[PDB]
Structure formats: C-alpha cells, structure tokens
Amino acid sequence: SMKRVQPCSLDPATQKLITNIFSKEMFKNTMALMDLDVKKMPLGKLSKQQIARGFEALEALEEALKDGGQSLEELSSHFYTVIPHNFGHSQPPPINSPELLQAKKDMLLVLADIELAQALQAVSEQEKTVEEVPHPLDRDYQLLKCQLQLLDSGAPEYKVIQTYLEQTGSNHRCPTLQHIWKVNQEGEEDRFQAHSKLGNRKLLWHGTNMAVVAAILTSGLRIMPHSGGRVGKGIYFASENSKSAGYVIGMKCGAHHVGYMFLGEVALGREHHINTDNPSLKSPPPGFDSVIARGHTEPDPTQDTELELDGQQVVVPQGQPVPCPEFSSSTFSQSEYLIYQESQCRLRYLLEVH
Numbered sequence: 001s002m003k004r005v006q007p008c009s010l011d012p013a014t015q016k017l018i019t020n021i022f023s024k025e026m027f028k029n030t031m032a033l034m035d036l037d038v039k040k041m042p043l044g045k046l047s048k049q050q051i052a053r054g055f056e057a058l059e060a061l062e063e064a065l066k067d068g069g070q071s072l073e074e075l076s077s078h079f080y081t082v083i084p085h086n087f088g089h090s091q092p093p094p095i096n097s098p099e100l101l102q103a104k105k106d107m108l109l110v111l112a113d114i115e116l117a118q119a120l121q122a123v124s125e126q127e128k129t130v131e132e133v134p135h136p137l138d139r140d141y142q143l144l145k146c147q148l149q150l151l152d153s154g155a156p157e158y159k160v161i162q163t164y165l166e167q168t169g170s171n172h173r174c175p176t177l178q179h180i181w182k183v184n185q186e187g188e189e190d191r192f193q194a195h196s197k198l199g200n201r202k203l204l205w206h207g208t209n210m211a212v213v214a215a216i217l218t219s220g221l222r223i224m225p226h227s228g229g230r231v232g233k234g235i236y237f238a239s240e241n242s243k244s245a246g247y248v249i250g251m252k253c254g255a256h257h258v259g260y261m262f263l264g265e266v267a268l269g270r271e272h273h274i275n276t277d278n279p280s281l282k283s284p285p286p287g288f289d290s291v292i293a294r295g296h297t298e299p300d301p302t303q304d305t306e307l308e309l310d311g312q313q314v315v316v317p318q319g320q321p322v323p324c325p326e327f328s329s330s331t332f333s334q335s336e337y338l339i340y341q342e343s344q345c346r347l348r349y350l351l352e353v354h
C-alpha cells in the first residue's frame with residue numbers, strides 16, 4: 001500500500017537551499033574537487049570507520065614528518081589505500097610537507113561532514129512504519145533540527161547585513177546577495193548564554209564548502225582534533241567578507257554560480273592580537289578569550305553599527321576596509337578572528353550569494 005507523500009511546507013528559496021545542501025551531485029563534485037576517487041568511494045559506502053582510519057594514517061605521517069620508521073612514501077601509500085584518490089589513474093603524490101599534511105587533514109574533515117550528511121539521511125524504522133511521509137525536502141529540513149527563517153528585504157537586520165556584505169566584499173566582483181535566512185539551532189542557545197557576561201560580541205563571516213553546510217546546521221561550527229591553520233586549532237572567522245568568500249566552494253547551477261556563507265555571533269571578550277602566523281595555538285594566552293590575527297586592513301571601525309540579538313548588543317561592521325598602520329607589517333593581509341571554545345559562537349544567519 002502506497003504511502004502518501006505530504007505536500008512541501010517550504011518556500012521556494014528554502015526548498016532550493018535544502019536541495020542544494022543534500023545534493024548527491026554536490027557531494028560527489030566536492031569529492032572530485034578534492035581529488036577523491038568517487039567510483040571507489042561512493043557516497044553510500046563512506047563510513048565513520050574509514051574516515052577514522054584515514055586520520056590514523058595521517059597521524060602516522062605527522063609523526064614521521066616531525067628513527068627508522070616507514071618512509072613518507074610507504075606511509076603515503078597506506079593513506080591512499082584507505083582513502084582512494086584519483087589522479088588520472090597515475091600514482092598519487094607523497095605527503096611530505098606540513099602544508100600537504102594539513103591539506104589532507106582538511107579534506108578528511110570535509111569528507112567527515114559529507115559522511116555525517118549521509119548518516120543523517122538514513123531511513124529510521126519509525127519512518128518505515130508510518131503511512132504518510134513528509135515531502136523529501138521537508139524531511140531533509142527536519143533532519144537538521146535547525147530553524148531557518150527566510151528574511152524579506154524590509155527585515156530590521158536585512159540592510160545592515162547587505163551593507164556588511166557590500167562594504168567588505170571584493171571591490172570589483174562582489175558576491176550578489178540572493179537570500180538571507182535567520183538561523184536558530186537550539187542546543188546552541190544554552191552554551192552560548194554561558195558567555196552572557198562577555199561583552200565584545202561581533203557578527204563575523206564564516207565561509208565553507210557547500211558540502212559542510214548541512215553538518216554545520218545540525219551541529220554548529222566545530223573544532224576537531226585535526227583542525228588547524230595559520231592561527232592553530234580553533235574556529236576561524238573574518239570581518240571582511242572577501243576573506244571568508246575565499247573558502248566558499250560554490251557550484252555551477254544553470255548559468256550561475258551558487259555559494260553559501262554564514263554570519264556567526266562571536267563572544268570575543270578580551271582580545272589577544274598577533275601579527276605573525278602561529279599554527280601551534282590551541283587556546284588564547286592566559287587571561288584572553290580570543291586571538292585576532294590582525295590584518296593590514298580592517299573594516300573602518302568608525303562605521304560599525306550594532307544589532308540587538310537576544311538582548312545583547314552585537315557589533316556589525318559597515319565600513320569599507322581601511323589601513324591599520326599599527327599592523328602594516330603583519331603577516332596577515334586581512335584579519336582572522338579565532339575562538340578556541342565552540343560555545344563562543346552562535347550561528348545567526350545564512351546567506352545565499354551568486
């Protein structure tokens with residue numbers, strides 16, 4: 001007996017979002033862009049065990065890169081058996097530098113979130129027994145356990161967000177704003193309230209691959225054991241959209257290019273400012289609640305405004321980037337804002353940009 005498929009409750013923009021972030025073609029494209037062999041690693045075959053084994057292989061490479069152990073070649077080969085790569089059916093190359101090691105760790109962190117999205121979609125037994133099912137897009141939305149509310153252009157914060165995007169995005173080829181959703185992942189509310197005493201809150205950009213958007217909506221921005229970069233093992237944000245936009249892996253759809261970007265509220269508290277890379281950081285120095293790798297520029301602070309989110313003032317930059325003489329010799333062209341506790345960020349908005 002045929003189950004009834006109930007009509008979709010979602011508006012068109014939301015249906016498109018949900019289609020995009022769970023799209024098998026998107027996920028496979030992402031795996032291709034990371035040099036993975038999708039024929040040998042289909043989406044349905046991806047497992048938590050394999051990803052675990054991949055990290056163990058990288059852990060061994062990291063120890064060798066830092067005594068008669070296996071060579072980097074041998075240790076690479078193991079990694080490529082565990083995580084099949086496609087390089088024109090030539091031999092994949094050896095992971096013999098800290099840069100390439102972090103690149104592979106980052107690839108696996110993406111792949112882990114792809115596997116999360118597949119595991120999220122497994123059909124439950126409650127679903128097999130009920131006689132009516134939600135529309136596939138309603139089902140996928142409900143799986144996120146995340147409220148998304150589409151904003152119209154007269155919403156109080158809409159202009160402020162658009163101005164942030166426009167003023168701090170690329171000057172020549174700015175991303176074009178298509179939609180904004182307010183994001184309310186509950187489960188986030190309470191840990192974030194923990195930092196209510198922490199003044200210095202700012203709304204900051206976080207760009208990602210489209211393949212990790214579902215994972216973020218389900219679980220927030222995360223720090224994992226192999227997370228890394230120029231400012232160590234934290235969650236990275238930018239005050240300049242153009243900086244975060246560099247991490248947006250968009251996807252060709254029709255004649256346009258679709259990308260998604262988050263705005264998070266970050267409780268920065270007492271800021272420690274640095275002007276040189278430190279990939280070894282795992283927390284701010286004692287007494288500090290965040291690390292800001294200060295750029296040569298910063299959105300002009302005289303133009304900052306504020307939005308009231310859950311009764312707290314949150315700074316939102318509105319200015320074009322201006323030079324900061326004190327940091328003119330920084331190793332950072334643009335600032336990177338780091339937190340080292342997941343609880344210091346609350347997702348607030350999701351933007352679709354073309």
Ligand SMILES: C[C@H](NC(=O)CCc1nc2ccccc2c(=O)[nH]1)c1ccccn1
Binds near residue numbers: 209237
């Ligand atoms: C490795 C990848 N990281 C990201 O997607 C964050 C990308 C990012 N990096 C930044 C660095 C400096 C300033 C801004 C950004 C940013 O907006 N996104 C990831 C994916 C899935 C789980 C954990 N990490």
